[PDB]
Design a binder for these strands. Structure first.
Ligand code: ZN
Ligand code: ZN
Ligand code: ZN
Ligand code: ZN
Lengths: 71, 74
DNA sequence: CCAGAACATCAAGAACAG
DNA sequence: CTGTTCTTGATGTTCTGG
């Protein structure tokens, strides 16, 4: 019943596994406009309801990594 | 011959609340400075703040400030 | 020159529309 | 569900009085 990216709330399957409302919207806007998001630390940046915004780079790869795509 | 931000690195504005800050940094501080922002760091309070990633970790940023010795006036 | 106020952006997460 | 638009907090850049 929970997201597999941020771990918050699941809304359904989108471009792959379960995602939160935002993780859905994020993944697209993100992977499409190809923006080299660079982590600010050591890439392990824990992502969740509270922090997911803090670092697109880490969030984004968590997507590809946890299975996700555009088609 | 260029003055640089002691916090973000962007083009420095002036001596604000304590040090050579960038435009935003000045403001950024004052706002959060005294307020319940409750910013949360991602990793270990040791991120690297530069003009293009200052938005990422507020916590670290502000902390860097307090560390650089900024202030409002006690 | 600087601390603030005032006016202007960005972008994330929610609410919609098809 | 997926594509698009709206709302709003967090930020940024100008404009002001002392
Ligand atoms: Zn999520
Ligand atoms: Zn990160
Ligand atoms: Zn700065
Ligand atoms: Zn941080």
């Amino acid at each position: 019943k929970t997201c597999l990216i941020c771990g918050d709330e699941a809304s359904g399957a989108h471009y792959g596994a379960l995602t939160c409302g935002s993780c859905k919207v994020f993944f697209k806007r993100a992977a499409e406009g190809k923006q080299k998001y660079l982590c600010a630390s050591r890439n392990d940046c824990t992502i969740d309801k509270f922090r997911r915004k803090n670092c697109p780079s880490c969030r984004l790869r968590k997507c590809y990594e946890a299975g996700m795509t555009l088609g």
